[PDB]
Amino acid sequence: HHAADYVLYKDATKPVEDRVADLLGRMTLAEKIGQMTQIERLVATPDVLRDNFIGSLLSGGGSVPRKGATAKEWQDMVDGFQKACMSTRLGIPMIYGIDAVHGQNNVYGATIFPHNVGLGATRDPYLVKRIGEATALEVRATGIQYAFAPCIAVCRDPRWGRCYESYSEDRRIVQSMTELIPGLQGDVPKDFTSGMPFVAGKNKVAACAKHFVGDGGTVDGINENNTIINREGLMNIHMPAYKNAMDKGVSTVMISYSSWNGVKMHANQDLVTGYLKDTLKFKGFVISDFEGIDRITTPAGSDYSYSVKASILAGLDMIMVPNKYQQFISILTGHVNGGVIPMSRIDDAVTRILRVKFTMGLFENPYADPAMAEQLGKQEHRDLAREAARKSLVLLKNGKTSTDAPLLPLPKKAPKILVAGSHADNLGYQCGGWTIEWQGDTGRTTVGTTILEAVKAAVDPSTVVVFAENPDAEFVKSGGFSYAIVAVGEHPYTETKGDNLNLTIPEPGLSTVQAVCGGVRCATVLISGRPVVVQPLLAASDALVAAWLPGSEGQGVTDALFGDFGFTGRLPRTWFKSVDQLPMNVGDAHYDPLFRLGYGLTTNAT
Ligand SMILES: OC[C@H]1O[C@@H](S[C@@H]2[C@@H](O)[C@H](O)O[C@H](CO)[C@H]2O)[C@H](O)[C@@H](O)[C@@H]1O
Ligand SMILES: *[C@@H]1O[C@H](CO)[C@@H](O)[C@H](O)[C@H]1NC(C)=O
Ligand SMILES: *[C@@H]1O[C@H](CO)[C@@H](O)[C@H](O)[C@H]1NC(C)=O
Ligand SMILES: *[C@@H]1O[C@H](CO)[C@@H](O)[C@H](O)[C@H]1NC(C)=O
């Protein structure tokens, strides 16, 4: 279709499938295996990307060009990698992935949204769609085209360190929140075939339903462990939201480190090929988790030849190596050369990877748009995060007796008020894991508003606000305070570091609540990724709010505390009486919760 040097796959007017087949037909084995290889930016250089025909890069948690990097710095980094990839013989652009799981959270100045558990509390799928829309803009602000989200785990045991990444223990809630996908990617057209990948264009990103499948069902909530459940239970609890994701055109699916009845997901042909590809008709690409294939074996990485064979034969398309690319490429090349892995399997993997790239417009817009840089941390997106934080809050108690005056909403005008606790003025703590660093961090790690700052921004000018992180009982009794807001809870964590068999918040937390509430009426704001042992906190407190991990916009908390809006959040998980009960989920035979799934007190706006 026209000039003498015409190349069909480079023609933007041609159908995606024709472009895919045209390109695939021209590729060497090296070029094919290259597409299947995703590497960390930490090991990438122009020569590496060119010489190995690399298909993808990622930033893992905390993998950044430098701390405090601007959006333009990120764009320049990604574009530098892309220029190298576009200089190959075939000029196949790389796709760059990142964990943008509650905003573009590795990036300084990015809006940080509430984590998924709090979003489940909102029961507001359209809110979550809007969060996806805002997240896509902030990801593209940094030049990145691919977000490793949503996590559609159905966390069945809050001892899991990733429970906060699950919208709910109830698969119906998780299904509803798959609206994140068309937020990130754009809405699919009316005609759309379930299982096809979709991204609308350069202002949207590819999404990733993860981690397939049963990541939330592991024994005792042990991260990456074994999910022991029959097929009926897997299909009833852990699988449904993957079908919703297919219906919404999710572009990629990431495989879980976990096992199902002792079979590693990264080696499970029956589920990856038989079910996801052949039954759900998924036509996007399947990606490993980080060193996921290494962890097929015990010890991890002890037979990488086997890891490569098992994973590629199981049906994975792209391997998040992410560091030992030469070994990966060498081993896979050897397996193909030896007939151990057929060319049909390689061609399928590359077909899927190319399909996603062509579909999303990556060949037409391989480089960043400098005009998008200003999307990062945009006030409109912060306003959305503030709305989400407020809606996520679950009011658990509002008065010690049925006859007391309800404490909340608090008055904005009072002579003197106390703000206290380890979590009252700690932005990193209110964001939790996957914020700037992989595991999160403490203190003023990004741009945002702490609970203390939010209180100061909310109150009447005549109201004196005193901050004391851990005041003693005498300080409070002598202080002349009208009331106190005390914020405590969990420290940031991610993945296995968050696995926790006791679910008791660190001290000082309870001691501070007891000291404060003993001296003045108190509203306790509990920051956590999950239900934690709460009876002692409740006993001390006049009012108590489960605020989850609300993100950068602390004013969402004060919007409800001071009555600008009513409390509306409802528990998206069971609140247990004790950890000895676990696992214990809504619908179980011997269900004995402290607060049932769906529980939440309300207030009316002042
Ligand atoms: O970052 C890519 C994927 O990685 C793993 S987390 C990974 C971790 O396993 C590794 O030890 O450290 C990396 C960098 O700190 C993490 O990104 C997670 O399981 C996925 O959810 C995530 O999408
Ligand atoms: C589960 O965890 C135990 C204890 O660390 C470990 O020995 C076992 O191999 C794990 N099982 C799986 C399937 O990951
Ligand atoms: C609870 O477990 C966590 C994580 O395993 C640990 O850091 C903490 O010390 C434990 N707390 C108690 C009270 O045992
Ligand atoms: C809140 O409004 C509802 C609905 O009108 C009402 O039933 C309830 O009594 C109100 N509570 C307060 C404290 O105003």
PDB file of N, CA and C in Angstrom, residues 59-61 97-107 110-113 115-116 131-132 134-136 138-140 142 144 146-151 165 180 184 205-208 210 434:
ATOM      1  N   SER A  59      10.522  -0.779  35.896  1.00  0.00           N
ATOM      2  CA  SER A  59      10.968  -0.370  37.242  1.00  0.00           C
ATOM      3  C   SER A  59      10.258  -1.237  38.255  1.00  0.00           C
ATOM      4  N   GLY A  60      11.023  -2.023  39.010  1.00  0.00           N
ATOM      5  CA  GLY A  60      10.478  -2.639  40.211  1.00  0.00           C
ATOM      6  C   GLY A  60      10.266  -1.588  41.280  1.00  0.00           C
ATOM      7  N   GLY A  61       9.716  -1.998  42.422  1.00  0.00           N
ATOM      8  CA  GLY A  61       9.520  -1.076  43.525  1.00  0.00           C
ATOM      9  C   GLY A  61      10.813  -0.356  43.869  1.00  0.00           C
ATOM     10  N   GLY A  97       7.046  -1.045  31.895  1.00  0.00           N
ATOM     11  CA  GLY A  97       6.082  -1.315  32.970  1.00  0.00           C
ATOM     12  C   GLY A  97       6.512  -0.826  34.345  1.00  0.00           C
ATOM     13  N   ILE A  98       5.528  -0.562  35.204  1.00  0.00           N
ATOM     14  CA  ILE A  98       5.797  -0.117  36.558  1.00  0.00           C
ATOM     15  C   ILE A  98       4.604  -0.458  37.455  1.00  0.00           C
ATOM     16  N   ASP A  99       4.862  -0.600  38.749  1.00  0.00           N
ATOM     17  CA  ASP A  99       3.774  -0.789  39.698  1.00  0.00           C
ATOM     18  C   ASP A  99       3.191   0.562  40.049  1.00  0.00           C
ATOM     19  N   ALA A 100       2.218   0.981  39.253  1.00  0.00           N
ATOM     20  CA  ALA A 100       1.375   2.150  39.550  1.00  0.00           C
ATOM     21  C   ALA A 100       0.100   1.535  40.110  1.00  0.00           C
ATOM     22  N   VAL A 101       0.133   1.240  41.408  1.00  0.00           N
ATOM     23  CA  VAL A 101      -0.927   0.486  42.079  1.00  0.00           C
ATOM     24  C   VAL A 101      -1.806   1.310  43.026  1.00  0.00           C
ATOM     25  N   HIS A 102      -1.417   2.546  43.340  1.00  0.00           N
ATOM     26  CA  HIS A 102      -2.306   3.475  44.028  1.00  0.00           C
ATOM     27  C   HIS A 102      -1.864   4.882  43.662  1.00  0.00           C
ATOM     28  N   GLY A 103      -2.028   5.172  42.369  1.00  0.00           N
ATOM     29  CA  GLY A 103      -1.331   6.270  41.724  1.00  0.00           C
ATOM     30  C   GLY A 103      -0.002   5.759  41.160  1.00  0.00           C
ATOM     31  N   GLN A 104       0.769   6.694  40.615  1.00  0.00           N
ATOM     32  CA  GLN A 104       2.088   6.431  40.025  1.00  0.00           C
ATOM     33  C   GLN A 104       3.093   6.496  41.178  1.00  0.00           C
ATOM     34  N   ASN A 105       2.982   5.493  42.039  1.00  0.00           N
ATOM     35  CA  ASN A 105       3.493   5.602  43.402  1.00  0.00           C
ATOM     36  C   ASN A 105       5.004   5.553  43.627  1.00  0.00           C
ATOM     37  N   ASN A 106       5.799   5.114  42.650  1.00  0.00           N
ATOM     38  CA  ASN A 106       7.261   5.204  42.771  1.00  0.00           C
ATOM     39  C   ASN A 106       7.794   6.622  42.557  1.00  0.00           C
ATOM     40  N   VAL A 107       6.956   7.534  42.066  1.00  0.00           N
ATOM     41  CA  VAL A 107       7.415   8.813  41.538  1.00  0.00           C
ATOM     42  C   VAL A 107       7.160   9.935  42.543  1.00  0.00           C
ATOM     43  N   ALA A 110       3.883  12.362  42.708  1.00  0.00           N
ATOM     44  CA  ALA A 110       2.689  11.716  42.173  1.00  0.00           C
ATOM     45  C   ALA A 110       1.580  11.681  43.217  1.00  0.00           C
ATOM     46  N   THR A 111       0.344  11.848  42.770  1.00  0.00           N
ATOM     47  CA  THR A 111      -0.811  11.685  43.665  1.00  0.00           C
ATOM     48  C   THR A 111      -0.837  10.245  44.174  1.00  0.00           C
ATOM     49  N   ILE A 112      -0.983  10.053  45.485  1.00  0.00           N
ATOM     50  CA  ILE A 112      -1.065   8.714  46.054  1.00  0.00           C
ATOM     51  C   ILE A 112      -2.496   8.474  46.531  1.00  0.00           C
ATOM     52  N   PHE A 113      -3.156   7.535  45.871  1.00  0.00           N
ATOM     53  CA  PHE A 113      -4.533   7.195  46.190  1.00  0.00           C
ATOM     54  C   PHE A 113      -4.586   6.197  47.339  1.00  0.00           C
ATOM     55  N   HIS A 115      -4.976   2.743  49.145  1.00  0.00           N
ATOM     56  CA  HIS A 115      -4.789   1.379  48.724  1.00  0.00           C
ATOM     57  C   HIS A 115      -6.129   0.646  48.544  1.00  0.00           C
ATOM     58  N   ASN A 116      -6.062  -0.472  47.839  1.00  0.00           N
ATOM     59  CA  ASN A 116      -7.254  -1.200  47.406  1.00  0.00           C
ATOM     60  C   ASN A 116      -8.242  -1.563  48.510  1.00  0.00           C
ATOM     61  N   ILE A 131     -10.189   6.899  39.343  1.00  0.00           N
ATOM     62  CA  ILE A 131      -8.829   6.739  39.854  1.00  0.00           C
ATOM     63  C   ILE A 131      -7.944   6.105  38.767  1.00  0.00           C
ATOM     64  N   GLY A 132      -8.455   5.112  38.055  1.00  0.00           N
ATOM     65  CA  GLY A 132      -7.722   4.535  36.940  1.00  0.00           C
ATOM     66  C   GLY A 132      -7.415   5.567  35.871  1.00  0.00           C
ATOM     67  N   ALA A 134      -7.098   8.840  36.247  1.00  0.00           N
ATOM     68  CA  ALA A 134      -6.111   9.789  36.759  1.00  0.00           C
ATOM     69  C   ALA A 134      -4.736   9.144  36.822  1.00  0.00           C
ATOM     70  N   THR A 135      -4.707   7.879  37.223  1.00  0.00           N
ATOM     71  CA  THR A 135      -3.463   7.128  37.302  1.00  0.00           C
ATOM     72  C   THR A 135      -2.825   7.004  35.923  1.00  0.00           C
ATOM     73  N   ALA A 136      -3.621   6.701  34.901  1.00  0.00           N
ATOM     74  CA  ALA A 136      -3.062   6.596  33.539  1.00  0.00           C
ATOM     75  C   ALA A 136      -2.388   7.899  33.147  1.00  0.00           C
ATOM     76  N   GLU A 138      -1.007  10.177  35.088  1.00  0.00           N
ATOM     77  CA  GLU A 138       0.222  10.404  35.858  1.00  0.00           C
ATOM     78  C   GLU A 138       1.322   9.420  35.491  1.00  0.00           C
ATOM     79  N   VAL A 139       0.936   8.220  35.053  1.00  0.00           N
ATOM     80  CA  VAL A 139       1.902   7.272  34.509  1.00  0.00           C
ATOM     81  C   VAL A 139       2.461   7.793  33.174  1.00  0.00           C
ATOM     82  N   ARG A 140       1.577   8.235  32.290  1.00  0.00           N
ATOM     83  CA  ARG A 140       2.015   8.802  31.010  1.00  0.00           C
ATOM     84  C   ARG A 140       2.793  10.112  31.188  1.00  0.00           C
ATOM     85  N   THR A 142       5.108  10.443  33.096  1.00  0.00           N
ATOM     86  CA  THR A 142       6.473   9.981  33.302  1.00  0.00           C
ATOM     87  C   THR A 142       6.983   9.169  32.106  1.00  0.00           C
ATOM     88  N   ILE A 144       5.710   6.396  30.857  1.00  0.00           N
ATOM     89  CA  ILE A 144       5.525   4.957  31.018  1.00  0.00           C
ATOM     90  C   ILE A 144       4.175   4.553  30.423  1.00  0.00           C
ATOM     91  N   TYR A 146       2.627   1.297  30.758  1.00  0.00           N
ATOM     92  CA  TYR A 146       2.150  -0.012  31.229  1.00  0.00           C
ATOM     93  C   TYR A 146       2.193  -0.047  32.765  1.00  0.00           C
ATOM     94  N   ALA A 147       1.019  -0.290  33.371  1.00  0.00           N
ATOM     95  CA  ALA A 147       0.872  -0.377  34.816  1.00  0.00           C
ATOM     96  C   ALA A 147       0.564  -1.800  35.227  1.00  0.00           C
ATOM     97  N   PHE A 148       1.273  -2.284  36.243  1.00  0.00           N
ATOM     98  CA  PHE A 148       1.029  -3.637  36.772  1.00  0.00           C
ATOM     99  C   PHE A 148      -0.128  -3.589  37.779  1.00  0.00           C
ATOM    100  N   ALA A 149      -1.334  -3.323  37.270  1.00  0.00           N
ATOM    101  CA  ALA A 149      -2.532  -3.163  38.084  1.00  0.00           C
ATOM    102  C   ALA A 149      -3.744  -3.413  37.199  1.00  0.00           C
ATOM    103  N   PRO A 150      -4.862  -3.882  37.767  1.00  0.00           N
ATOM    104  CA  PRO A 150      -5.136  -4.107  39.180  1.00  0.00           C
ATOM    105  C   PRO A 150      -4.721  -5.461  39.726  1.00  0.00           C
ATOM    106  N   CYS A 151      -4.318  -5.441  40.993  1.00  0.00           N
ATOM    107  CA  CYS A 151      -4.334  -6.639  41.793  1.00  0.00           C
ATOM    108  C   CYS A 151      -5.779  -6.999  42.110  1.00  0.00           C
ATOM    109  N   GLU A 165      -3.693  -4.872  49.225  1.00  0.00           N
ATOM    110  CA  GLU A 165      -3.762  -4.796  47.768  1.00  0.00           C
ATOM    111  C   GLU A 165      -5.007  -5.501  47.198  1.00  0.00           C
ATOM    112  N   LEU A 180     -11.364  -0.388  37.415  1.00  0.00           N
ATOM    113  CA  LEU A 180     -10.029   0.231  37.284  1.00  0.00           C
ATOM    114  C   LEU A 180      -9.490   0.051  35.860  1.00  0.00           C
ATOM    115  N   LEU A 184      -7.835   2.848  33.411  1.00  0.00           N
ATOM    116  CA  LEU A 184      -6.432   2.842  32.969  1.00  0.00           C
ATOM    117  C   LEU A 184      -6.281   2.810  31.451  1.00  0.00           C
ATOM    118  N   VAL A 205      -2.859   3.684  29.427  1.00  0.00           N
ATOM    119  CA  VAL A 205      -1.811   2.687  29.619  1.00  0.00           C
ATOM    120  C   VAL A 205      -2.356   1.271  29.512  1.00  0.00           C
ATOM    121  N   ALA A 206      -1.498   0.329  29.150  1.00  0.00           N
ATOM    122  CA  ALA A 206      -1.827  -1.078  29.316  1.00  0.00           C
ATOM    123  C   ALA A 206      -1.967  -1.425  30.794  1.00  0.00           C
ATOM    124  N   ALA A 207      -2.955  -2.255  31.105  1.00  0.00           N
ATOM    125  CA  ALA A 207      -3.198  -2.737  32.455  1.00  0.00           C
ATOM    126  C   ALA A 207      -2.791  -4.207  32.581  1.00  0.00           C
ATOM    127  N   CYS A 208      -2.901  -4.727  33.808  1.00  0.00           N
ATOM    128  CA  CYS A 208      -2.407  -6.054  34.145  1.00  0.00           C
ATOM    129  C   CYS A 208      -3.232  -6.618  35.289  1.00  0.00           C
ATOM    130  N   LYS A 210      -3.678  -9.167  38.056  1.00  0.00           N
ATOM    131  CA  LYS A 210      -2.678  -9.955  38.765  1.00  0.00           C
ATOM    132  C   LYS A 210      -3.188 -10.366  40.151  1.00  0.00           C
ATOM    133  N   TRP A 434       4.505   0.291  48.819  1.00  0.00           N
ATOM    134  CA  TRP A 434       4.439   0.713  47.425  1.00  0.00           C
ATOM    135  C   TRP A 434       4.274   2.242  47.333  1.00  0.00           C
TER     136      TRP A 434
END
